[PDB]
Amino acid sequence: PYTVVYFPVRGRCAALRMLLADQGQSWKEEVVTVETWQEGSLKASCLYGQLPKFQDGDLTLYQSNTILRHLGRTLGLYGKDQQEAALVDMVNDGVEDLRCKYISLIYTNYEAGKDDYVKALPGQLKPFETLLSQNQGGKTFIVGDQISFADYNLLDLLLIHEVLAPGCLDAFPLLSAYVGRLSARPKLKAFLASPEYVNLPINGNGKQ
Amino acid sequence: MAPYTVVYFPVRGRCAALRMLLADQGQSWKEEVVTVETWQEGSLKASCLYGQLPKFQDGDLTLYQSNTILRHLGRTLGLYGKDQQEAALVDMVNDGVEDLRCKYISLIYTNYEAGKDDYVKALPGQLKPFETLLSQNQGGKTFIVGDQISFADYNLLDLLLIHEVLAPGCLDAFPLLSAYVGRLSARPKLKAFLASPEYVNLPINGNGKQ
């Protein structure tokens, strides 16, 4: 019922894929190679000229976070009420903010900007540790008592940063335990260990 | 006091859209202004979730992130589409607006002089998506999504307003967006807000560039 149109990398589809997998949803991967993308056709047909492109039945969507929020809304991963929904958005936007800085590093300034990025990393991750500390002692989810699309997005954020800066979660016990706990969920655990995830590079330029 | 409180710097910036939304919806709110000098003191910043503003107060609910505030008000005031599918289209529009706003932000604050020519050159291709969406929704005679206004409309409206200042006549190539701006700006409550000192006497950005 779901189709993900994206390049052969984890990137901005990693979180939504983990969500679909953990939620026991099946989906088709429409892999677009760089060569195919360079042909120009598909790009021209995309709303903002970019991927991922997402299909849910007759509904076609663009924008990674829109897909996340759509799945969150339709699959019930958006908090229990409006207050929690606001909290879920606050976390996701925060994740998006850091991901954008991560993307800038990876794609435009890896060699000269990595040292400074890693130096400031602790200060960028602390907010999430604080949020967990204020919710059920950090024993459940980033918001409320049920998983939300923000959890999958934050999880990915944390996974890629552990690769960029190994041990960056050492000073944050709640985040560390959070990563292990979510990664241990049966279906997600299976996904993370599968070739579909493992044999895909994190980004499109070979940097991580 | 008022249930709504906006904590931000004395600029329109990332609070312009949510303010238009509140004003157009007949809502009142408190403006708690933070001067750069106060911000430099460090206390407030240290207390903010992500170390930045805006900070929004709704009763005892304290929020951060401009788009979280927009979505929150959109949810609470019924400005998020008529159903789940429209809500998704509303998000798609806002995320697009957010993407352009970040580029606009990069130009204004980190590379105005050297990047303006290319930014303006590339502007048309960046605005086209919104004109397209408009053309696919009742000939663009109503809103960006569906037949009722959404929080995305206020965000897109602001985006268009500041780009007309950045590049006068940029909407000449987009009749639907042009009429759209004139139409929404004409809404009684919004029109009054846009002409008021509360809005007019605040600069668009915080570094004097526009």
Coordinates of C-alpha atoms in Angstrom, one line a residue:
Chain A
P1 CA 0.0 0.0 0.0
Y2 CA 3.0 2.3 0.5
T3 CA 5.7 3.2 -2.0
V4 CA 8.9 5.0 -1.1
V5 CA 10.7 6.7 -4.0
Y6 CA 14.2 7.7 -3.0
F7 CA 17.9 7.3 -3.8
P8 CA 19.8 4.2 -2.6
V9 CA 20.8 5.7 0.8
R10 CA 19.3 5.9 4.3
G11 CA 19.3 9.7 4.6
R12 CA 15.9 11.2 4.9
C13 CA 14.0 8.0 4.5
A14 CA 15.8 6.1 7.4
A15 CA 13.3 7.3 10.0
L16 CA 10.1 6.7 8.1
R17 CA 11.4 3.2 7.1
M18 CA 12.1 2.3 10.7
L19 CA 8.5 3.5 11.5
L20 CA 6.9 1.4 8.8
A21 CA 9.0 -1.6 9.7
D22 CA 8.4 -1.3 13.5
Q23 CA 4.7 -0.8 12.8
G24 CA 4.6 -4.0 10.8
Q25 CA 3.7 -2.2 7.6
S26 CA 4.8 -3.4 4.2
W27 CA 6.1 -1.1 1.5
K28 CA 7.7 -1.0 -1.9
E29 CA 11.1 0.7 -2.5
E30 CA 11.3 2.5 -5.8
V31 CA 15.0 3.0 -6.0
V32 CA 16.1 6.0 -8.1
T33 CA 19.7 5.9 -9.1
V34 CA 21.8 9.1 -9.6
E35 CA 21.9 8.4 -13.3
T36 CA 18.2 8.1 -13.5
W37 CA 17.8 11.3 -11.5
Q38 CA 20.1 13.1 -13.8
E39 CA 17.9 12.2 -16.7
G40 CA 15.6 14.9 -15.3
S41 CA 12.1 13.5 -15.9
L42 CA 11.2 12.4 -12.4
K43 CA 12.8 15.5 -10.8
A44 CA 10.7 17.8 -13.0
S45 CA 7.6 16.0 -11.9
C46 CA 8.3 16.4 -8.2
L47 CA 6.6 19.2 -6.3
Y48 CA 9.8 20.7 -5.0
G49 CA 12.1 19.0 -7.5
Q50 CA 13.3 16.6 -4.8
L51 CA 13.0 13.2 -3.2
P52 CA 11.7 11.4 -1.2
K53 CA 8.4 11.0 -3.0
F54 CA 5.7 9.0 -1.0
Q55 CA 2.6 7.2 -2.1
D56 CA -0.2 6.1 0.2
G57 CA -3.0 4.7 -2.0
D58 CA -4.0 7.5 -4.4
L59 CA -2.3 10.1 -2.1
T60 CA 1.2 11.2 -3.3
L61 CA 3.3 13.2 -0.9
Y62 CA 6.7 15.0 -0.8
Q63 CA 8.8 16.3 2.2
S64 CA 10.3 13.7 4.6
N65 CA 8.6 15.2 7.7
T66 CA 5.2 15.5 6.0
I67 CA 5.4 11.7 5.3
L68 CA 6.4 11.2 9.0
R69 CA 3.5 13.3 10.2
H70 CA 1.1 11.7 7.8
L71 CA 2.0 8.2 9.0
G72 CA 2.0 9.5 12.6
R73 CA -1.5 10.9 12.1
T74 CA -2.9 7.8 10.2
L75 CA -1.2 5.1 12.3
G76 CA -1.8 6.8 15.6
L77 CA 1.8 7.7 16.4
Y78 CA 1.2 11.4 17.3
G79 CA 0.5 11.5 21.0
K80 CA -2.8 11.0 22.8
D81 CA -4.1 14.6 22.6
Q82 CA -3.3 18.1 21.3
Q83 CA -0.9 18.9 24.1
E84 CA 1.2 15.8 23.5
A85 CA 0.9 16.4 19.7
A86 CA 2.5 19.8 20.3
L87 CA 5.3 18.2 22.3
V88 CA 5.8 15.6 19.5
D89 CA 6.2 18.4 16.9
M90 CA 8.6 20.3 19.2
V91 CA 10.8 17.2 19.4
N92 CA 10.7 16.5 15.6
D93 CA 11.5 20.1 14.7
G94 CA 14.4 19.9 17.1
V95 CA 15.5 16.7 15.4
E96 CA 15.1 18.3 12.0
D97 CA 17.2 21.3 13.1
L98 CA 20.1 19.1 14.1
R99 CA 19.7 16.9 11.0
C100 CA 20.0 20.0 8.8
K101 CA 23.3 20.9 10.6
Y102 CA 24.4 17.3 10.1
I103 CA 23.5 17.5 6.4
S104 CA 25.4 20.7 5.9
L105 CA 28.5 19.1 7.5
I106 CA 28.3 15.9 5.6
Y107 CA 27.6 17.4 2.2
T108 CA 29.3 20.8 2.2
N109 CA 32.0 21.1 4.9
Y110 CA 33.0 17.7 6.2
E111 CA 36.8 18.0 6.2
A112 CA 37.1 21.6 7.6
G113 CA 33.9 21.6 9.8
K114 CA 33.9 18.2 11.5
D115 CA 36.1 19.2 14.5
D116 CA 33.9 22.1 15.4
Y117 CA 30.7 20.1 14.9
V118 CA 31.8 17.3 17.1
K119 CA 32.9 19.9 19.7
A120 CA 29.4 21.4 19.8
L121 CA 27.6 18.0 19.6
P122 CA 27.1 17.5 23.3
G123 CA 25.2 20.8 23.6
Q124 CA 23.0 19.8 20.7
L125 CA 22.1 16.4 22.2
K126 CA 21.5 17.4 25.8
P127 CA 18.0 18.8 25.0
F128 CA 16.8 15.3 24.1
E129 CA 18.3 13.8 27.3
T130 CA 16.5 16.6 29.2
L131 CA 13.2 15.8 27.6
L132 CA 13.6 12.1 28.4
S133 CA 14.4 13.1 32.0
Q134 CA 11.1 14.9 32.3
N135 CA 9.0 12.0 30.9
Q136 CA 8.5 8.9 33.0
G137 CA 12.2 9.1 34.0
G138 CA 13.1 8.5 30.4
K139 CA 11.8 4.9 30.6
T140 CA 9.2 5.1 27.9
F141 CA 9.2 7.4 24.8
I142 CA 10.3 10.9 24.0
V143 CA 6.7 12.1 24.5
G144 CA 3.9 10.4 26.4
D145 CA 3.4 6.7 27.0
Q146 CA 3.3 5.6 23.3
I147 CA 5.8 5.7 20.4
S148 CA 5.4 8.6 18.0
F149 CA 6.9 9.5 14.6
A150 CA 9.3 11.8 16.5
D151 CA 10.8 8.7 18.3
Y152 CA 11.8 7.1 15.0
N153 CA 13.3 10.4 13.8
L154 CA 15.2 11.0 17.0
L155 CA 16.4 7.4 17.0
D156 CA 17.9 7.8 13.5
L157 CA 19.4 11.1 14.5
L158 CA 21.1 9.4 17.4
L159 CA 22.2 6.4 15.3
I160 CA 23.9 8.5 12.7
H161 CA 25.7 10.6 15.3
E162 CA 27.1 7.6 17.1
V163 CA 28.7 6.8 13.7
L164 CA 29.9 10.4 13.2
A165 CA 31.2 10.8 16.8
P166 CA 31.5 7.3 18.5
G167 CA 30.6 7.5 22.2
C168 CA 28.6 10.8 21.9
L169 CA 25.9 9.2 24.0
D170 CA 28.2 8.2 26.8
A171 CA 27.4 11.3 28.8
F172 CA 23.7 10.8 28.3
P173 CA 22.5 7.6 30.1
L174 CA 18.8 8.2 29.2
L175 CA 19.5 8.6 25.5
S176 CA 21.8 5.6 25.5
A177 CA 19.3 3.3 27.1
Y178 CA 16.6 4.8 24.9
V179 CA 18.5 3.8 21.8
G180 CA 19.1 0.2 23.0
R181 CA 15.5 -0.2 24.1
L182 CA 13.9 1.1 20.9
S183 CA 16.4 -0.8 18.8
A184 CA 15.4 -4.0 20.7
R185 CA 11.8 -3.8 19.6
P186 CA 11.3 -7.1 17.7
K187 CA 10.3 -5.8 14.2
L188 CA 12.7 -2.8 14.4
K189 CA 15.5 -5.1 15.6
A190 CA 14.9 -7.3 12.6
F191 CA 14.9 -4.3 10.3
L192 CA 18.1 -2.8 11.6
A193 CA 19.9 -6.1 11.2
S194 CA 18.6 -6.7 7.6
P195 CA 20.6 -6.1 4.5
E196 CA 17.9 -3.6 3.3
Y197 CA 19.2 -1.3 6.0
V198 CA 22.7 -2.5 6.7
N199 CA 24.0 -2.5 3.1
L200 CA 22.7 1.0 2.4
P201 CA 25.1 3.9 2.9
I202 CA 24.0 6.6 5.4
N203 CA 24.5 9.4 2.9
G204 CA 25.0 9.8 -0.8
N205 CA 28.6 11.1 -0.9
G206 CA 30.3 8.2 1.1
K207 CA 30.8 10.4 4.2
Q208 CA 29.5 9.5 7.7
Chain B
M1 CA -3.5 37.9 31.9
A2 CA -3.7 36.5 28.3
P3 CA -3.4 32.7 27.8
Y4 CA -1.0 33.3 24.9
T5 CA 2.5 34.8 25.3
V6 CA 5.1 35.3 22.6
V7 CA 8.7 35.5 23.8
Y8 CA 11.0 36.7 21.0
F9 CA 13.5 39.4 19.8
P10 CA 12.1 42.7 18.6
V11 CA 11.8 41.6 15.0
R12 CA 9.2 40.0 12.8
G13 CA 11.3 37.1 11.6
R14 CA 10.1 33.6 12.6
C15 CA 7.1 35.0 14.6
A16 CA 5.5 37.0 11.8
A17 CA 3.3 34.2 10.5
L18 CA 2.0 33.0 13.9
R19 CA 1.2 36.6 14.8
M20 CA -0.7 37.1 11.6
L21 CA -2.5 33.9 12.4
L22 CA -3.5 35.0 15.9
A23 CA -4.6 38.4 14.7
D24 CA -6.6 37.1 11.8
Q25 CA -8.3 34.7 14.1
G26 CA -9.4 37.4 16.5
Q27 CA -7.0 36.2 19.2
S28 CA -5.1 38.4 21.7
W29 CA -1.7 37.7 23.0
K30 CA 1.1 39.1 25.2
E31 CA 4.4 40.1 23.6
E32 CA 7.4 39.5 25.9
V33 CA 10.3 41.2 24.1
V34 CA 13.9 40.1 24.6
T35 CA 16.5 42.6 23.7
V36 CA 19.9 41.4 22.3
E37 CA 21.5 42.7 25.5
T38 CA 19.2 40.7 27.7
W39 CA 19.9 37.6 25.5
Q40 CA 23.6 38.1 25.9
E41 CA 23.2 37.9 29.6
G42 CA 22.7 34.2 29.0
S43 CA 20.1 33.2 31.6
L44 CA 17.1 33.1 29.3
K45 CA 19.0 31.2 26.6
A46 CA 20.2 28.6 29.0
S47 CA 16.6 28.0 30.0
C48 CA 15.3 27.5 26.5
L49 CA 14.9 23.9 25.3
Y50 CA 17.1 24.3 22.2
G51 CA 18.8 27.5 23.4
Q52 CA 16.8 29.7 21.0
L53 CA 13.6 31.8 20.5
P54 CA 10.7 32.0 19.8
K55 CA 9.3 30.6 23.1
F56 CA 5.6 30.4 23.2
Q57 CA 3.3 30.1 26.3
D58 CA -0.2 28.7 26.1
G59 CA -1.4 28.5 29.7
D60 CA 1.3 26.4 31.5
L61 CA 2.2 24.8 28.1
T62 CA 5.6 26.1 27.1
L63 CA 6.6 25.6 23.5
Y64 CA 9.7 26.3 21.4
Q65 CA 10.1 25.9 17.5
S66 CA 8.2 28.4 15.3
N67 CA 6.5 25.6 13.2
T68 CA 5.5 23.7 16.4
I69 CA 3.7 26.9 17.5
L70 CA 2.1 27.2 14.0
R71 CA 0.9 23.6 14.1
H72 CA -0.3 23.9 17.7
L73 CA -2.4 27.0 16.9
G74 CA -3.5 25.3 13.7
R75 CA -4.7 22.3 15.6
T76 CA -6.4 24.2 18.4
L77 CA -8.0 26.9 16.2
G78 CA -9.2 24.5 13.4
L79 CA -6.7 25.7 10.8
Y80 CA -5.3 22.3 9.8
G81 CA -7.5 21.0 6.9
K82 CA -10.9 19.3 6.9
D83 CA -9.6 15.8 7.1
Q84 CA -6.4 13.7 7.5
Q85 CA -5.5 13.9 3.8
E86 CA -5.8 17.7 3.7
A87 CA -3.8 18.0 6.9
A88 CA -1.0 16.1 5.1
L89 CA -1.2 18.6 2.2
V90 CA -1.1 21.4 4.7
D91 CA 2.1 20.0 6.2
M92 CA 3.6 19.5 2.7
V93 CA 3.0 23.2 2.0
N94 CA 4.5 24.4 5.3
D95 CA 7.6 22.2 5.0
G96 CA 8.1 23.7 1.6
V97 CA 7.7 27.2 3.0
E98 CA 10.1 26.3 5.8
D99 CA 12.7 25.1 3.3
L100 CA 12.6 28.4 1.4
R101 CA 12.6 30.4 4.6
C102 CA 15.9 28.6 5.6
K103 CA 17.5 29.6 2.3
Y104 CA 16.2 33.2 2.8
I105 CA 17.6 33.1 6.3
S106 CA 21.0 31.9 5.1
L107 CA 21.1 34.8 2.6
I108 CA 20.0 37.5 5.0
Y109 CA 22.3 36.5 7.9
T110 CA 25.3 34.8 6.4
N111 CA 25.7 36.0 2.8
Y112 CA 23.5 38.9 1.7
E113 CA 26.1 40.8 -0.3
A114 CA 27.7 37.9 -2.2
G115 CA 24.6 35.8 -2.6
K116 CA 21.7 38.1 -3.4
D117 CA 22.1 38.1 -7.2
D118 CA 22.0 34.3 -7.5
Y119 CA 19.3 34.0 -4.9
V120 CA 17.0 36.4 -6.8
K121 CA 17.9 34.6 -10.0
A122 CA 16.9 31.3 -8.4
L123 CA 13.8 32.7 -6.7
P124 CA 11.3 32.0 -9.6
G125 CA 12.1 28.3 -9.5
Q126 CA 11.5 28.3 -5.7
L127 CA 8.2 30.1 -5.8
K128 CA 6.8 28.1 -8.7
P129 CA 5.7 25.1 -6.6
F130 CA 3.3 27.3 -4.6
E131 CA 1.8 28.8 -7.7
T132 CA 1.4 25.3 -9.1
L133 CA -0.5 24.1 -5.9
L134 CA -2.6 27.2 -6.1
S135 CA -3.5 26.5 -9.7
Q136 CA -4.6 23.0 -8.7
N137 CA -6.9 24.2 -6.0
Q138 CA -10.1 25.9 -7.4
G139 CA -8.1 28.0 -9.8
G140 CA -6.2 29.5 -6.9
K141 CA -9.2 31.6 -5.9
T142 CA -9.4 30.3 -2.3
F143 CA -6.5 29.0 -0.1
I144 CA -3.2 27.1 -0.5
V145 CA -5.0 23.9 0.6
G146 CA -8.7 23.2 0.5
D147 CA -11.5 25.7 0.9
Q148 CA -10.6 27.0 4.3
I149 CA -7.5 28.9 5.6
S150 CA -4.8 26.9 7.3
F151 CA -1.7 27.7 9.3
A152 CA 0.3 27.1 6.1
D153 CA -1.4 30.0 4.5
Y154 CA -0.1 32.5 7.1
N155 CA 3.4 31.1 6.8
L156 CA 3.3 31.2 3.0
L157 CA 1.8 34.7 3.1
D158 CA 4.7 36.0 5.2
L159 CA 7.3 34.2 3.0
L160 CA 5.8 36.0 0.0
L161 CA 5.6 39.4 1.8
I162 CA 9.2 39.4 2.7
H163 CA 10.4 38.2 -0.7
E164 CA 8.5 41.1 -2.4
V165 CA 10.6 43.4 -0.2
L166 CA 13.8 41.4 -1.0
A167 CA 13.0 41.4 -4.8
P168 CA 10.3 43.9 -5.7
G169 CA 8.0 42.5 -8.4
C170 CA 9.0 38.9 -7.9
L171 CA 5.4 37.9 -8.0
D172 CA 4.9 39.5 -11.4
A173 CA 5.6 36.1 -12.9
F174 CA 3.0 34.4 -10.7
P175 CA -0.5 35.9 -11.0
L176 CA -2.1 33.4 -8.7
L177 CA 0.3 34.1 -5.8
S178 CA 0.0 37.8 -6.5
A179 CA -3.8 37.8 -6.2
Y180 CA -3.5 35.4 -3.3
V181 CA -1.3 37.9 -1.4
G182 CA -3.7 40.8 -2.1
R183 CA -6.7 38.7 -1.1
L184 CA -5.4 37.3 2.2
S185 CA -3.9 40.7 3.1
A186 CA -7.4 42.2 2.6
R187 CA -9.0 40.1 5.4
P188 CA -10.3 42.7 7.8
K189 CA -8.5 41.5 11.0
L190 CA -5.3 40.7 9.2
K191 CA -5.4 44.0 7.2
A192 CA -5.7 45.9 10.5
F193 CA -2.8 44.0 12.1
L194 CA -0.5 44.5 9.1
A195 CA -1.1 48.3 9.2
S196 CA -0.7 48.5 13.0
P197 CA 2.5 49.7 14.8
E198 CA 2.7 46.3 16.5
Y199 CA 3.7 45.0 13.1
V200 CA 5.0 48.0 11.1
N201 CA 7.4 49.3 13.7
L202 CA 9.3 46.0 13.9
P203 CA 12.1 45.3 11.4
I204 CA 11.7 42.1 9.3
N205 CA 15.1 40.7 10.4
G206 CA 17.5 41.4 13.2
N207 CA 20.6 42.6 11.3
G208 CA 18.9 45.4 9.4
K209 CA 18.9 43.5 6.1
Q210 CA 15.8 42.8 4.0

